[PDB]
Write a protein that binds this ligand. Structure first.
Ligand SMILES: *[C@@]1(O)[C@@H](COP(=O)(O)OP(=O)(O)OP(=O)(O)O)O[C@@H](n2cnc3c(=O)[nH]c(N)nc32)[C@@H]1O
Ligand SMILES: [Mg+2]
Ligand SMILES: [Zn+2]
Ligand SMILES: [Zn+2]
Ligand SMILES: [Zn+2]
Ligand SMILES: [Zn+2]
Lengths: 1097, 46, 65, 49, 55, 50
RNA sequence: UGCU
């Protein structure tokens, strides 16, 4: 009697994606920031006034962002498209407007609409022009319908604000110190200040440490200062256990050693220990009330809640001092994800505060001593301050908020347009707070808390392994709630007030503490009933579905989380060994009677947090459901991310193989969108004949990657041929490459600017310099048109000019010097289009789109969607390629020796499924933890007449005799990578050198030479080739001849020593230029190296 | 010499001289492409 | 972008059958029997016609015109 | 050990790039430090006078 | 002018990433090699305007 | 919209029904071509609205 | 930022 299984259960994922998913997170965050958070910030800073000249004020009424507009026209707004912004290298922002009221000369004057700044509008947002548009309108606006969006366009470049991952605030963390002292820490962060206070047991007693105290003081003194002076009450609050009293005894003894017994004495001691920023007593009380533990509120200098909080902290420390139950930082249940909305809100608040301060300063400087003419803010309301601030913060990526003392870098990154998959995977990346500080390996390791939230296999391979992560296919990020009804329900559910009872009740085994966002909500008994009622109410809908509730029995604490940034995942509710969702509900969803919101409202599917699933039980499948089950997994394949979703049958391969496959798919070559022809980027790679994979995954169908594939399916035969596929290499077919297989197109952009300087002069394009001998343009200016601009359709060779630009040297007749834009390239390029635009600064921007059609050759890198990266080793002709009975020759021959060590059975399964699909005219599915089985494809093969194992009778093409072993033929989806041997080839002649040190440059684009690093020098030393090392590091790199005086040992010039004013003891000497520079720097540093020369004999 | 260009949305042949505000008639779009050359270009089928 | 004229593995003329395959798709013929009726015995041309994506019209929708 | 004269190095150690695209040039930090030192010496002399 | 033949047909032709002013008649190399900056060198040169450097 | 190189490659992949026995191989160079060893095919298509 |  097997449990019935709902087959259409996977239909819950598309319905969820219809309203949430991959890119909806940033869109919703930006919409909330521009709709509610900006209004809240404006209301917080609504009124600003100056101390001098009272009765003067500036009141803000309502702020608007408007629709995206461009300031190109002469004081005229005009709708501008994101594609136009990309073409013109401008910003896609909307004018921020506000209505204000002020008093000029005590007469109230109001303004209904006044611009104050420009906010870069995110694409596909609420106010974006792309939203609510059909694909026809997208085509009219020159934008791809499948484009994920969610990124900003500033100065033509596409920047994406990555999701930052930090530790949860207002939470006690018990951990070992540097030397190994088990202590506690708490970082109380409110809307104004953020203070971290620690507590250590370095000498058996609890010392509290804060940044505002000269020296750490005992906790008992702080207890006595915070109102509670009875040692009995302090001990009862700490705990009533024998070991607790034994551990706390030293603290009581140390406190009794001193004469501190009253609140006044304790406050005096604290004030004496307070650092400079009874007066000392007042400062100590103020620090204890506001500075220390800011998250714990005090009604009116009532430190009861703070006393209970520190008592619970000390109790946790005492409990941890025994059994090593140390909390881990890598537990994602205590992590918070800050989307772009919160960052933009903080930045806007800081910029608005700075603008208000500047306006107040200007008023204080202008109003009292200017003139009887009454001053008003409108004459000094800076409209470019906010615009420039936002543009710089989005472009440079460095955020420096002084009001919060936050100095972050790398917040924004250039959106990688290598492929649609690359852009979609980069849009859903997560950066960590560590940012490669230490090779801890803790946060870099894969924690079990990442189940269903982040992709386990998707991680960049390199130094950033483990710090850069991607979200799962099905997940959500919560926002902030009001916390009103939550507190009301908690109070109504019988939660006793903490102030009503003493701390002795905290030591009982049945009394469980309840916390709310780090604040002690109170105490409770029989927490099972409380949790059950809270969950039932949340399912009913009276409480927000995103409010998480968790219970830890080791500490007896029930946490109620309602802050934003928490990761949640939908789960089907299971009650009494039967899920709530049934076949009838799935059929209704398929027909359209209900949706995911209806499922959420009907208590069928609910969102679970990491802390909530820590206590709740989840089932993978229906057959796994037992008596002790509360939820059911929707789909197992959703564990993988977007980049990992392309892997066909990933559960049959190795984890490093999947990681490498995701890393290479982030660079896979293919189409970007339907507007790739009109799109003009600095570097683009396209495929001539892209084909969708035969073995496509449900994730592929969801992300619509089949519409924009990034590879081709080729008849690959796994065998060894000619020994040119020794180590991961492959052999390509000459005829296949000739017939268009693997053909790629490289598009490069060359931009030129003709700007007007301060003087009334402008850069001009000169016509082609015709040769008077032949009455035709010279070889360099051959491709130029009549206007001096290269025309499309022609070919460009090396050292040829594209724009014959000439600029003045004055900034009487202007003197123009030529600075043409020469083309640096080994191979020829063809001009496809030449776009000419005019900016508001009368500057002419000219962009020429160069194209290069390259054929796969030796050295090109290829991937097979399984991390089996390879390089083209040899290109054998078709007659040399083997043939089967049907006459089919393999296009790619891969090394079978790479299968045993890598355990890539998934590649074989994908090949078999693809062969079956191309035989039966179907598309097999390689869904993770499922998909088409091997038996089905074997049956398809045996029905179509081919072998049930893929191996077929093949005859050798060279000798014409059959092979002793059968060859494994089949269609495999191979994708070409951007790594080209034509671009990676380098050869450096003498070339140029650096001004500071006369050595070759670094990069290849600047014609740089190779570096014989310290390891190379060590190898040469070990070999003992002294002459070779000398010729490498002195003769061929920085050879130079200096003049050294044999009397003083200093460096001369032209055989003359200025120090001694003589030239008899001066002699030439070979020396590296770097060594000469070192000697000069030492002489500047007053460390004079005196060289005593002598004969070589 | 009459220099000809093409609008980004109208796709109409517009003639403008040097040092002129880049614009197209019966519209206000400011994207102007250059027509393909009339010279003979040889391509290889390889 | 557009259907290739020649097949990668063998080299049979297949670009001339793209419109015929589209017409068969518009008719009641399935993928399998359409590819069988088109005369493609070996699976290479079947894969070439089946795994091909039609993006030329999508690009022409953005073409200047 | 107590210095009364500072040895300004040659221009080979202090490379200067003439950025004609704007009204400025790229100078190393040593030049700015020496300029600040000279300014401070002049200010000290002015205060003494 | 060329130091060997005295001709004034001096052309700047870069031969495989090597700037070189060479005579077009006899091929006599007049000058070769140019001293550029490097990226780390470029980054460590600070931008100072004429408004401060000039005085 | 199709690239010039892709168009040339597609045209090269198009077979010709001409009898090869009646022609000869073109010598090294000679891009102008001779009547014996060359064939010219013109393709002029102008698309317009109906 | 990517590559081994
Ligand atoms: C990347 O996100 C950040 C991180 O760069 P850092 O390593 O923090 O830069 P650094 O600390 O200053 O390194 P170093 O001292 O060696 O110079 O910065 C961007 N980024 C850094 N380095 C590169 C690079 O070499 N190439 C590219 N394309 N981007 C780089 C990244 O956004
Ligand atoms: Mg390697
Ligand atoms: Zn001397
Ligand atoms: Zn127009
Ligand atoms: Zn074929
Ligand atoms: Zn000469």
């Amino acid at each position: 009697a097997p449990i019935p299984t709902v087959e259409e259960k996977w239909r819950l994922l598309p319905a969820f994606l219809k309203v949430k998913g991959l890119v909806k997170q940033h869109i919703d965050s930006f919409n909330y920031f521009i709709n509610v958070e900006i209004k809240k910030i404006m209301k917080a800073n609504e009124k600003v006034t100056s101390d001098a000249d009272p009765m003067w004020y500036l009141k803000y009424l309502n702020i608007y962002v408007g629709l995206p507009d461009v300031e190109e026209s002469f004081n005229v707004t005009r709708p501008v498209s994101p594609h136009e912004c990309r073409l013109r290298d401008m910003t896609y922002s909307a004018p921020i407007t506000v209505d204000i009221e002020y008093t000029r000369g005590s007469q109230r004057i109001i303004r209904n609409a006044l611009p104050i700044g420009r906010m870069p509008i995110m694409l596909r947002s609420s106010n974006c022009v792309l939203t609510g548009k059909t694909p026809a309108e997208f085509a009219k606006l020159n934008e791809c319908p499948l484009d994920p969006g969610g990124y900003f366009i500033v100065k033509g470049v596409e920047k994406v604000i990555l999701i930052q991952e930090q530790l949860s605030k207002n939470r006690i963390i018990v951990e070992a110190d540097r030397k190994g002292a088990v202590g506690a820490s708490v970082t109380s962060s409110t809307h104004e200040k953020k203070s971290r206070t620690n507590m250590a047991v370095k000498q058996g007693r609890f010392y509290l440490r804060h940044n505002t105290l000269s020296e750490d003081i005992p906790i008992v003194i702080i207890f006595k200062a915070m109102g509670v002076e009875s040692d009995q009450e302090i001990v009862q609050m700490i705990g009533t256990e024998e070991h607790v009293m034994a551990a706390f005894g030293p603290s009581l003894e140390e406190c009794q050693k001193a004469q501190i017994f009253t609140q006044m004495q304790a406050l005096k001691y604290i004030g004496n220990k307070v650092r400079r920023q009874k007066t000392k007593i007042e400062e100590a009380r103020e620090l204890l009330a506001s500075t220390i533990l800011t998250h714990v509120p005090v009604k009116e200098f009532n430190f009861r809640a703070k006393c209970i909080y520190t008592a619970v902290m000390v109790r946790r420390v005492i409990l941890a001092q025994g059994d090593n139950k140390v909390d881990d930082r890598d537990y994602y249940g205590n992590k918070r994800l800050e989307l772009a909305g919160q960052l933009l809100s903080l930045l806007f608040e800081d910029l608005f505060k700075k603008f208000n301060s500047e306006m107040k300063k200007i008023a204080d400087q202008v109003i009292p001593k200017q003139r009887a003419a009454q001053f008003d803010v409108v004459k000094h309301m800076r409209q470019d301050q906010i615009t420039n601030g936002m543009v710089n913060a989005i472009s440079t990526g460095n955020w420096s908020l002084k009001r919060f003392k936050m100095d972050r870098q790398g917040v924004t990154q250039v959106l990688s347009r290598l492929s649609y998959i690359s852009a979609l995977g980069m849009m859903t990346r997560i950066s960590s707070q560590f940012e490669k500080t230490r090779k801890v390996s803790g946060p870099r390791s894969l924690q079990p808390s990442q189940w269903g939230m982040l992709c386990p296999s998707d991680t960049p391979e390199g130094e950033a392994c483990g710090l850069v992560k991607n979200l799962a296919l099905m997940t959500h990020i919560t926002t902030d709630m009001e916390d009103g009804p939550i507190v009301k329900l908690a109070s109504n559910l019988g939660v006793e007030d903490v102030n009503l009872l003493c701390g002795e009740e905290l030591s009982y085994p049945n009394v469980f503490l309840v916390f709310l966002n780090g604040n002690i909500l109170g105490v409770i008994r029989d927490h099972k009933k409380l949790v059950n009622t809270f969950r039932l109410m949340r399912r009913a809908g009276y409480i927000n579905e995103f409010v998480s509730i968790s219970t830890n029995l080791t500490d007896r604490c029930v946490y109620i989380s309602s802050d934003g940034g928490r990761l949640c995942r939908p789960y089907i509710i299971v009650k009494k060994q039967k899920p709530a969702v049934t076949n009838k509900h799935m059929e209704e969803l398929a027909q359209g009677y209900r949706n995911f919101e209806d499922f959420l409202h009907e208590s069928l599917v609910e969102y679970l947090d990491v802390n909530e699933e820590n206590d709740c039980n989840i089932a993978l499948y229906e057959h796994t459901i037992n008596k002790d089950t509360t939820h059911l997994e929707i789909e197992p394949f959703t564990l993988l991310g977007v980049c990992a979703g392309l892997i066909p049958y990933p559960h049959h391969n190795q984890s490093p193989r999947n990681t490498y496959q995701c890393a290479m798919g982030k660079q896979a070559m293919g189409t970007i969108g339907y507007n790739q022809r009109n799109r003009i980027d600095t570097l683009m790679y396209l495929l001539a004949y892209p084909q969708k994979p035969m073995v496509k995954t449900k994730t592929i169908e969801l992300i619509e990657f089949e519409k924009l594939p990034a590879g081709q399916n080729a008849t690959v035969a796994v065998m060894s041929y000619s020994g040119y596929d020794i180590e991961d290499a492959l052999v390509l077919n000459k005829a296949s490459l000739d017939r268009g297989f693997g053909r790629c197109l490289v598009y490069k952009n060359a931009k030129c600017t003709l700007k007007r300087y301060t003087n009334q002069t402008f850069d001009k394009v000169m016509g082609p310099m015709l040769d008077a001998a032949t009455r035709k343009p010279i070889w360099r200016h051959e491709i130029l048109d009549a206007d001096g601009i290269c025309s499309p359709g022609e070919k460009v060779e090396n050292k040829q000019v594209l724009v014959n630009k000439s600029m003045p040297t004055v900034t009487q007749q202007p003197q123009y010097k030529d600075v043409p834009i020469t083309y640096k390239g080994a191979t020829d390029s063809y001009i496809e289009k030449v776009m000419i635009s005019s900016n508001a600064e009368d500057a002419f921007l000219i962009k020429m789109l160069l194209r290069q059609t390259r054929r796969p050759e030796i050295g090109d890198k290829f991937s097979s969607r399984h991390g089996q990266k390879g390089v083209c080793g040899l290109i054998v002709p078709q007659e040399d390629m083997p043939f089967c009975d049907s006459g089919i020759c393999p296009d790619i021959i891969m090394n079978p020796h790479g299968f045993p060590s890598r355990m890539t059975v998934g590649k074989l399964i994908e090949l078999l499924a693809g062969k079956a699909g191309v035989l039966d005219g179907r598309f097999h599915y390689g869904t993770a933890f499922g998909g088409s089985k091997v038996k089905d494809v074997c049956e398809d093969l045996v029905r179509h007449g081919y072998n049930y194992l893929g191996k077929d009778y093949v005859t050798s093409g060279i000798t014409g005799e059959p092979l002793e072993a059968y060859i494994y033929f089949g269609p495999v989806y191979y994708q070409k990578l951007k790594h080209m041997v034509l671009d990676k080839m380098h050869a450096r002649a003498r070339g140029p050198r650096a001004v500071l040190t006369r050595q070759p440059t670094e990069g290849r684009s600047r014609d740089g030479g190779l570096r014989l690093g310290e390891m190379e020098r060590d190898c040469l030393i070990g070999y003992g080739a002294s002459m070779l090392l000398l010729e490498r590091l002195m003769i061929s790199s920085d050879a130079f001849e200096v003049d050294v005086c044999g009397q003083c040992g200093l460096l001369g010039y032209s055989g003359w020593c200025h120090y001694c004013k003589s030239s008899c003891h001066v002699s030439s000497l070979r020396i590296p230029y770097a060594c000469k520079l070192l000697f000069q720097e030492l002489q500047s540093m007053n460390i004079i190296p005196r060289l005593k020369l002598s004969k070589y004999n | 010499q009459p220099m000809i260009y093409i609008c980004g949305e109208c796709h109409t042949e517009n003639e403008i001289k040097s040092r002129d505000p880049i614009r197209c008639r019966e519209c206000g779009y400011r994207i102007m492409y250059k027509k393909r050359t009339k010279r003979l270009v040889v391509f290889d089928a390889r | 972008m557009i259907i290739p004229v020649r097949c990668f593995t063998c080299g049979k003329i297949v670009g001339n059958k793209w419109e015929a395959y589209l017409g068969l798709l518009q008719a009641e013929y399935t993928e399998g029997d359409a590819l069988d009726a088109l005369g493609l015995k070996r699976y290479c041309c079947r894969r070439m016609l089946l795994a091909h994506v039609d993006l030329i019209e999508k690009l022409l929708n953005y073409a200047p015109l | 050990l107590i210095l009364t004269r500072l040895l300004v190095p040659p221009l080979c150690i202090r490379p200067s790039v003439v950025s004609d695209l704007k009204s400025g040039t790229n100078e190393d930090d040593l030049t700015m430090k020496l300029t600040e030192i000279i300014f401070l010496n002049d200010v000290i002399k002015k205060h003494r006078i | 002018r060329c130091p060997d033949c005295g001709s004034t047909e001096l052309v700047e032709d870069s031969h495989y990433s090597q700037s070189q002013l060479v005579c077009s008649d006899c091929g006599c190399v007049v000058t070769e090699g140019v001293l550029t900056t490097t990226f780390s060198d470029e980054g460590n040169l600070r931008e100072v305007t004429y408004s401060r450097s000039t005085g | 919209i199709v690239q010039d190189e892709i168009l040339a490659h597609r045209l090269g992949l198009i077979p010709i029904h001409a009898d090869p026995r009646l022609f000869e191989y073109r010598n090294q160079g000679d891009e102008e071509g001779t009547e014996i060893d060359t064939l010219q095919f013109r393709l002029q298509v102008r698309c317009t609205r109906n």
